[PDB]
Amino acid sequence: PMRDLKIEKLVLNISVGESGDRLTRASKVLEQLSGQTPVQSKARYTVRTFGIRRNEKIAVHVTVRGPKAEEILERGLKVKEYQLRDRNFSATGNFGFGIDEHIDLGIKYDPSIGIFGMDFYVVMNRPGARVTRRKRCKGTVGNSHKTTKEDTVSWFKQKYDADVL
Amino acid sequence: VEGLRRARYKFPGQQKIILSKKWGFTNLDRPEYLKKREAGEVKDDGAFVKFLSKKGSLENNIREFPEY
Amino acid sequence: GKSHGYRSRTRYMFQRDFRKHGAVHLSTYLKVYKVGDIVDIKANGSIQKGMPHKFYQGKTGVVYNVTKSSVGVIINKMVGNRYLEKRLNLRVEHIKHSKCRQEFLERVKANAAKRAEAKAQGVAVQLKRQPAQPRESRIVSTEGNVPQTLAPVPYETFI
Amino acid sequence: KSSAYSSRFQTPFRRRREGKTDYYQRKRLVTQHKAKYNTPKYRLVVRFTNKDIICQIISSTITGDVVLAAAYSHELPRYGITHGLTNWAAAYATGLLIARRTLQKLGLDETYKGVEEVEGEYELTEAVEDGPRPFKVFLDIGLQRTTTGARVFGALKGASDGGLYVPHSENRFPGWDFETEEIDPELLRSYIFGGHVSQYMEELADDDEERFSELFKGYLADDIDADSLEDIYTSAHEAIRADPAFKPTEKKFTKEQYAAESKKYRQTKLSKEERAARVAAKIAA
Amino acid sequence: PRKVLQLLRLTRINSGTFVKVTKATLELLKLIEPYVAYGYPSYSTIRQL
RNA sequence: AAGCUCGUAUCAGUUUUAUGAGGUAAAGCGAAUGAUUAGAGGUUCCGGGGUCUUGACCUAUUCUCAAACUUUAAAUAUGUAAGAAGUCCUUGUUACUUAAUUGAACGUGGACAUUUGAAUGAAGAGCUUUUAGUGGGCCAUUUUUGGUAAGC
RNA sequence: GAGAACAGAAAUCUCCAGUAGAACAAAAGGGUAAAAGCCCCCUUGAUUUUGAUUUUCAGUGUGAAUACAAACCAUGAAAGU
RNA sequence: GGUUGCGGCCAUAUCUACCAGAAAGCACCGUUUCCCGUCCGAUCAACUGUAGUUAAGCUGGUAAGAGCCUGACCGAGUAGUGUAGUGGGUGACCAUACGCGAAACUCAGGUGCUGCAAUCU
Ligand SMILES: [Mg+2]
Ligand SMILES: [Mg+2]
Ligand SMILES: [Mg+2]
Ligand SMILES: [Mg+2]
């Protein structure tokens, strides 16, 4: 009655190799694709193999909530043609997938911007998840109220009319 | 017994050879081990054995030691 | 060379008890100390301020001064062939009330009560403690308790 | 979890495990200057739950905390306020109630009357020359986050206006802008008499009507418009200053009658004899 | 042990004193055990001493 | 050595009663950390040969250890207390403290005698001035470091 | 540990478990989890005047440290520090 | 007796897996004009108690549960140790005399108690 699955948030991640004009150019698309200003991430350490160093500002990402996240998810599922493997589903009830280009969603090519891929990840939960997030009397979710892999897969099949390999 | 006697010459000081009343390398007496084995309280794991206690969950002590 | 720092050789003395780390319970800060109280010293390792020197660990003294968060304690220290008085400024976390005399006050109260009740009736109030006395004569019965004979056991190995 | 992990685990304090008490803040709130001996320190405990506000005056003891006076927002309907028992103006009324109630019990209600001409002016309770000093309490917000315009400082404003001496600054009241170092008395006065709720009712009604019926439905049923709650808050303040004494709600049933009802729905533990029977029966199954 | 012997007034060999038997005095006797001989006097022994 | 102030007075290389402090001996490793023997049952789209072995881990066990490891933890040594400078009742002082004669400290006045607050002892207790020599040590039982050991 | 285009043992993103097995300029030992760690905001008390106390100790000095008094400040809604 | 606010001792209170919960309370939950804070009204802030739900939190119970606590002439007066001898033994070490006295192990029982204020078949 009050344990219906729902989308907590949708985070879009673009892992850029380096910083500079390349990273901020990739940050441009997320501004109008999600209607929110994204945030950038800096590398934890230095490898000297992938081409990054400490605090090099290598990545950019943004998360969205509400029905707008569902609209972006719908437009992102057209690339996969409502088809995902048996994988991509976590044991905690979350699922995600990645794409190779962003223009297919409807974004104009804009040679001044270029071509980028994106990572989509969806976090599923049930009403009452505030108990783990609230400051006072912070607690844990009961076992029967937790989201499992099977429940998310079944929920993913009843809607979107999609199939799992 | 003769094998341990020959080993004494390699050691300084005095050593004694004692026939233990335990069953092998277990800490149970010779007749006590017979009682537990015939009651189905002994299970073999590798070269040693595991015993059954009166403690713990029944669902774990029933799958093990089915004979008891 | 040798090392004689302030907290030398205090590896175990200033440790917390097992499964007793963390913050101090509030009853430590709610106790009231007044000049003349007898207190004992036990340093708390989690409070680095107002910490007594390792010599005074386990010593008992008398409060002579009370401050905002600390008290002043009088300690007699044996130096050479004489005793010298030492004054310590210690925070309340490192001290507690001494029970060596709280029980003595109870006997003082009890002596007066027994002194007063005997004042009207009986002479020889007898308000002095005595050590343990030798046992008096008694009779031991064997009804259902017949003595059982014991003997030394022979030597065995059972290894 | 392994057996070694459980054996070496140190459990926090019970109040810390439940997540209600901040012991870092409590130590500094409760500890008293040791040269003041048994002088109590009084906290103004203000806690906000759903559809309820609680205000208490509490001192500390070894056995436990002791309540000197208490006030609840659900007692407001006896003074005039029946809607919005958790808003900013409700906190002000509850804060005023606990201030007047505490002073009357101590006997200092004639002195330190407070202010009866509130207009959002920041001022402390000054002591009277050649007379007793005002009763002093310290605000205890618990785990509440300090933000300007929050309701917890609304109860602070009411208690200070009620005659109690509470030390505070004005930079956390509504109407303070970080750009300049001053307060706006007009905006603060608006929040005291529910100005922020009145403006919403006017604007919500002129924007959509299905929401103005879903919300504020109690106001429409009892015939209160958006320019009348100004007076009822003023009437409530005068009523509180008239009879601030506490009157308990009449008990329909006695305590022992309540106990008999509750024991019927409470499950009891088993004896050691019947625990052994369950094991024996389970073995034979 | 030297201090206990002084407190019992035994400062030279073949000296003797009477001691009341309590818990406070039985612990004194155990400290000087390898230096003294003691027992339970009789009436004749006390009279002749 | 010279004494001085006093003389029942408090003291004591001691015990007892009450109440503290400690991390050594021992003990422990299917308790943490670090060493360490042996198999057993599982686990890989994630080591490597080979169509099934050897390593890695995980689970329940097993043998043996620690001056610079430890949950537990002695014996012997060690702090304080056992009253007149004490306990109880009433109320005087203050610029300190309290919302407040509230509290804190120091007092006035009244009551309680030496089975007056455990044991034993007490060539009396307390105190001051001044100055000599000495400032190479060594031996024994027990504890113990370096060293094969030493009358080291 | 389970998940996400390039992406792999190690790039970034998400969830779960996690008594500290991390971190706290340095040697080592203590101490610390709504913190003493990480990030952010505001600051100069790392200030003025002289005494008492602890450690080494002759109860000298030096070094270091502890608790107050009388001022003047910083921070916070505040108790406080 | 149930519940809430503030606590005291800080596992008999923790952890794992299940089950139950009348009334009130608590909670989840609804909304974004205003104060306020964010990449995101998720956290934080404000507004309504209205649209809903006991699903979770929460409380209680169950388990030859893990852990924890208490006790025992359980192990054990064992290990260790103060004191003594012109005691034993080449030695290493050990026995006895007067005293003190463990830990592991085994077994049994237990699974929060309680102070202040308010409220409820
Ligand atoms: Mg705080
Ligand atoms: Mg040591
Ligand atoms: Mg040892
Ligand atoms: Mg001799």
Residue numbers in the entry:
A (entry chain LO): 8 to 172
B (entry chain LN): 149 to 216
C (entry chain QT): 2 to 160
D (entry chain LI): 8 to 292
E (entry chain LK): 99 to 147
From the paper:
In yeast, just like in mammals, residues R28 and R36 of RPL39 face the lumen of the NPET and are in direct proximity to the nascent polypeptide chain. Expression of yRPL39 in a RPL39Δ background resulted in a correctly assembled 60S subunit that did not differ significantly structurally from the wild type 60S (RMSD = 0.192 Å), corroborating the feasibility of the complementation approach. The high degree of structural conservation of the 60S ribosomal subunit core in general, and of the region directly surrounding RPL39 in particular (mouse: RMSD = 0.52 Å, human: RMSD = 0.25 Å) further justifies the use of a heterologous system.
In this study, we investigated the expression pattern, structure within the ribosome and effect on protein synthesis of the ribosomal protein paralog 39L (RPL39L). As obtaining pure populations of RPL39L ribosomes from mice remains challenging, to analyze the impact of RPL39/RPL39L on ribosome structure we turned to the yeast, which has only the RPL39 gene. We complemented RPL39-deficient yeast cells with either mouse RPL39 or RPL39L, and analyzed purified RPL39 and RPL39L ribosomes. Ribosomal particles from the WT yeast strain Sc60S, the yeast RPL39 KO strain rpl39Δ, yeast rescue strain rpl39Δ-ScRPL39 and the mouse RPL39/RPL39L-complemented RPL39 KO strains rpl39Δ-MmRPL39 and rpl39Δ-MmRPL39L were studied by single-particle cryo-EM.
